[PDB]
Amino acid sequence: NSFYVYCKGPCQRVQPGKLRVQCSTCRQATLTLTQGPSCWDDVLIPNRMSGECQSPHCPGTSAEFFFKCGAHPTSDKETSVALHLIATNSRNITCITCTDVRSPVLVFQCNSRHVICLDCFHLYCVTRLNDRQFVHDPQLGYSLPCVAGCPNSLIKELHHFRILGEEQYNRYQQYGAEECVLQMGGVLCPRPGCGAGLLPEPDCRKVTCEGGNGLGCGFAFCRECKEAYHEGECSAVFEASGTTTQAYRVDERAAEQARWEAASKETIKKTTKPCPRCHVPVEKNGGCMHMKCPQPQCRLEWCWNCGCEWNRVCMGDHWFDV
Amino acid sequence: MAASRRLMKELEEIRKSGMKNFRNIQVDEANLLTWQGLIVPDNPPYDKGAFRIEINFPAEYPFKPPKITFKTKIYHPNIDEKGQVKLPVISAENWKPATKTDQVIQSLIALVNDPQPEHPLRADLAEEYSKDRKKFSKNAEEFTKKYGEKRPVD
Amino acid sequence: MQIFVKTLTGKTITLEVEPSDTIENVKAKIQDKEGIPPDQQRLIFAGKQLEDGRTLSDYNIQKESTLHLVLRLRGG
Amino acid sequence: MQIFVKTLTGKTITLEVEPSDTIENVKAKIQDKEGIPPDQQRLIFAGKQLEDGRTLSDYNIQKESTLHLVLRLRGG
Ligand SMILES: [Zn+2]
Ligand SMILES: [Zn+2]
Ligand SMILES: [Zn+2]
Ligand SMILES: [Zn+2]
Ligand SMILES: [Zn+2]
Ligand SMILES: [Zn+2]
Ligand SMILES: [Zn+2]
Ligand SMILES: [Zn+2]
Numbered sequence: 001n002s003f004y005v006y007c008k009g010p011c012q013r014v015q016p017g018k019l020r021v022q023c024s025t026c027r028q029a030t031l032t033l034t035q036g037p038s039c040w041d042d043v044l045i046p047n048r049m050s051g052e053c054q055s056p057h058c059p060g061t062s063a064e065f066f067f068k069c070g071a072h073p074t075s076d077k078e079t080s081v082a083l084h085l086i087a088t089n090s091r092n093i094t095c096i097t098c099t100d101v102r103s104p105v106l107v108f109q110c111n112s113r114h115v116i117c118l119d120c121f122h123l124y125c126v127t128r129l130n131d132r133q134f135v136h137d138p139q140l141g142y143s144l145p146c147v148a149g150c151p152n153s154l155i156k157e158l159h160h161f162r163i164l165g166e167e168q169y170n171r172y173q174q175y176g177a178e179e180c181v182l183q184m185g186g187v188l189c190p191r192p193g194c195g196a197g198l199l200p201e202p203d204c205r206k207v208t209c210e211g212g213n214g215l216g217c218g219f220a221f222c223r224e225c226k227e228a229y230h231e232g233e234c235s236a237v238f239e240a241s242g243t244t245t246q247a248y249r250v251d252e253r254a255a256e257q258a259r260w261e262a263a264s265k266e267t268i269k270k271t272t273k274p275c276p277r278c279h280v281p282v283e284k285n286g287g288c289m290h291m292k293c294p295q296p297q298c299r300l301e302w303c304w305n306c307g308c309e310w311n312r313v314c315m316g317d318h319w320f321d322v
Numbered sequence: 323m324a325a326s327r328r329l330m331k332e333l334e335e336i337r338k339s340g341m342k343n344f345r346n347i348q349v350d351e352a353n354l355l356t357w358q359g360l361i362v363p364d365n366p367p368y369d370k371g372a373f374r375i376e377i378n379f380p381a382e383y384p385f386k387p388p389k390i391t392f393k394t395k396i397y398h399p400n401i402d403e404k405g406q407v408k409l410p411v412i413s414a415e416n417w418k419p420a421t422k423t424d425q426v427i428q429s430l431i432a433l434v435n436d437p438q439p440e441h442p443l444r445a446d447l448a449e450e451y452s453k454d455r456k457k458f459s460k461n462a463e464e465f466t467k468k469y470g471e472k473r474p475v476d
Numbered sequence: 477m478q479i480f481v482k483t484l485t486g487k488t489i490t491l492e493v494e495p496s497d498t499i500e501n502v503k504a505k506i507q508d509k510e511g512i513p514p515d516q517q518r519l520i521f522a523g524k525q526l527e528d529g530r531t532l533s534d535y536n537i538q539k540e541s542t543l544h545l546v547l548r549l550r551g552g
Numbered sequence: 553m554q555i556f557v558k559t560l561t562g563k564t565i566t567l568e569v570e571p572s573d574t575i576e577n578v579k580a581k582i583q584d585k586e587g588i589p590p591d592q593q594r595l596i597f598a599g600k601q602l603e604d605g606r607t608l609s610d611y612n613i614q615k616e617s618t619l620h621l622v623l624r625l626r627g628g
Contacts, residue, residue: 008615077571097384097419098328123324124419127385131414132511147419166616170556173618175511190488192478193562213588214623215561226488227542238484241550243415251420258420413552414513441552 002087002289002318004104005080006162007069014104014163016070017080018316019043023053024062030054031063038287038320040084070317081159085109087322091267095120096148096251096258105260110146110153113260118163125164129172136183142176148258149250190226191219205229275302277309287320325383326354329423333357336424343431344424345474346374355379357423358393362474365435367462368398371470373434377423384419387412390430397458397465399439399447408443409433477539481506481519484547493532500528506545516548553615555608557582557595560622574607582621594622 003017021031024047032052042049043065050062067082068074089103095117102117116124128134128144135154136142146153161169178188181197189196189209196215200207205223210216221227225234257263272281278298284291290310293300301310305318333349346360358376363369373396379388390412392405401407411421411429442448451458477495482488489510493502503514519526521535521543537543553571557578558564565585569578579590595602597611597619613619 098324099331100327119324123382123385127382130507130511131513149418170616170618173558187486190480190490192480192490196561211561211623212625214559214621217561221488224486226482226486238546240484246416249411249416249418251418251422254420408552410552414515415551 001070002320002322003067003070004083004086005067005069006083006159007071007080009078011069011071014083014086015080016317017067017082018070019065019067019319020316021049021063021065023055023058023060024064025060026053026055026058027064028055033063036288036290036315036319040082044082044084081162083160084157085155085160089115090322091260091263093260093263094257096254097124099257107260108146108150108153109155110148110150112148112150112255114146114148114150114255114258115260116147116258122164125161125172126168129168129175132175134179136179138183142172142179148255149248189219190221191217194219273304273307275300276307277302289318289321290315325379325381328384329354329379332423341424341427344427355381355383355388359427360471360474361427361431361434363431363434367459368396368434368466369473370463371466372473373470375430384421386414387417387421387426390426394471395465395469396434397447397462397469398434398437399442399444399451400433400437402443406443407433408441410441479537479539479541479543481543481545483545488542495533495537496531498528498531499526502532503528512547513551516551518546518548520544520546555613556616556618557621558618560620564618565621569608571607571609571613574604575602576604579604588623592624592626594624596620596622 001016003019004014005017007013007015020029021033022029023031030053032054033049034051035049037043037049046064047062049065053060053063067080068078069080085108086104086106089101089105092101093105093115094101095105096114097120098117100117102119105115105117106121107113107115124147125144134142135145137154140154140156141158143154143156143158145151161172164172181188186197189198191209194209194217196209196211198207198209198215200223206220206229207223208216208221209219220229222229227234270284272283274280275282275293275298277300278293278295280293280295280298282291282293284304289304291302291304293302302308303310303314303318304321306314308314333354337347343362343364344359345362346358348358350356356376356378358374360372360374362372373392373394375390375392375394377388377390380386390407390409392401392407394405395403407430409426409429410416411426437451439448439451447458450461477493478490479493480488480490489506491502491505491509493505499519500514503517503519506512506517507514514528521537524535526535526543553569555567555569556564557567565582567578567581567585569581575595576590578595579593582593583589590604597613600611602611602619
């Protein structure tokens with residue numbers, strides 16, 4: 001399945017995802033798409049794919065995409081988390097950590113494109129999580145880059161860490177929320193189990209966990225050292241040693257073998273397929289699995305991966321190529 | 323489990339292909355994580371003796387790298403008294419997932435054969451190796467025959 | 477028992493341990509919450525270094541006690 | 553659906569609430585659970601403040617979704 005989703009209720013794991021589109025304002029399934037799209041970059045952004053809304057008191061041209069869980073049946077307030085990076089391992093690429101072919105595979109947003117078996121991705125986040133070695137951005141958040149050695153290649157999705165789970169992601173939320181405060185400009189308070197973000201005067205060294213019912217609760221701590229409050233000073237600090245620039249060591253050979261498009265190039269015949277009804281070669285141009293079988297005689301809509309005639313299940317399950 | 327998938331492919335490769343300097347690879351059947359090996363120095367003054375190493379690959383592998391612990395006293399200013407060589411490639415702050423262990427041994431043995439006092443641990447040995455090249459040679463002659471293991475037969 | 481631990485640049489914490497428990501255990505616990513390698517943790521107490529094998533009972537530490545954690549920033 | 557109202561200081565509340573239930577309902581329920589009124593309690597969800605008329609529908613929140621609770625302070 002091209003679309004995978006995370007389903008709370010009662011799946012708790014990466015399911016198939018049934019892609020549907022609706023109107024922006026009225027929000028029904030009465031939409032006329034101009035084009036029926038190429039990639040997750042269409043579907044993830046609000047107000048990209050636009051067309052014509054059918055049911056007639058509704059002039060909102062732009063549409064809204066939503067993903068549902070493709071295993072057991074659902075109702076409308078179900079909206080599952082769309083996993084846009086992770087597709088099935090159709091081309092059969094190895095993991096860059098481990099010479100193993102497993103399905104499906106994560107694809108990081110990096111330039112040469114690096115992919116991975118699933119169980120490593122649990123290991124990669126948590127070893128970074130235990131050690132604290134993520135990359136925190138102001139706008140995006142507290143995420144990891146590409147694993148091989150790729151600059152400017154962060155995953156743009158907090159909800160992908162829900163594959164790690166309600167235990168780990170909540171811990172990720174605590175460590176992430178702490179990670180923002182140093183970059184914003186604060187310190188975590190040193191009382192055991194309090195963590196009060198408090199703002200005293202500049203001049204006053206003695207700051208106290210003060211509040212009442214919540215927050216403040218009996219601890220006067222020194223500003224520089226964070227001890228019980230005193231007049232003079234504490235002992236001296238340790239020498240610092242700057243790293244500053246760090247050439248991240250990448251493996252040449254394994255990075256070749258961990259490429260999503262090639263690595264070794266198994267899928268070669270994926271360009272022209274014999275259509276059943278007509279019996280003619282037709283070329284697949286770009287993203288769309290949905291291909292029109294482009295003959296004066298024929299005129300027929302058929303799916304590339306399936307082969308049979310284009311229906312809403314083939315629309316929903318795997319609309320576009322991954 | 324994961325490291326066992328990792329390392330049995332590597333252990334078959336490194337024993338079959340053979341690192342030549344690195345010899346006497348004592349690896350356990352059940353205990354895959356501990357690898358012991360006898361490195362053979364070729365440059366003076368370490369080729370007078372021979373040094374054993376025990377690389378302890380941890381539970382989380384290969385996300386965290388192992389610690390190459392020597393079970394040998396060696397007269398060399400990177401490595402300390404107990405058994406902790408200082409290696410740039412085995413680092414936490416700088417690490418790649420796709421690291422070959424023989425690549426670390428290529429890092430290690432070149433480090434053993436060519437002494438770095440630019441990034442050492444011990445102060446007087448790094449002081450001595452930078453300042454008095456003869457005396458560090460002379461002490462390493464006396465040290466390594468006394469402490470280090472014998473030269474092999476092949 | 478409740479103990480405070482101190483760092484180089486300000487941030488003091490606590491950690492739940494006993495007299496019996498091990499410093500390699502406690503560095504694992506501080507590695508759990510704080511986010512530092514046991515390789516890069518230098519615990520000092522009363523002008524003395526805390527060993528990974530050695531324990532809080534040997535060094536003799538009670539509740540309401542501070543551990544001076546010096547940081548390794550060149551881990552190499 | 554279970555929500556984790558994770559406050560700033562440590563402790564977090566578990567509450568059985570729908571998308572249909574509002575913040576004014578949850579301020580009643582958190583007042584039931586802990587014992588703090590609607591006027592003191594301030595709900596926020598990742599920056600944006602939660603208001604009394606708006607709901608878990610408008611702010612768009614699911615089961616296992618972490619809200620924050622900030623407390624107003626009366627009389628200095
Ligand atoms: Zn589901
Ligand atoms: Zn409409
Ligand atoms: Zn893998
Ligand atoms: Zn990459
Ligand atoms: Zn407090
Ligand atoms: Zn003090
Ligand atoms: Zn045809
Ligand atoms: Zn089909």
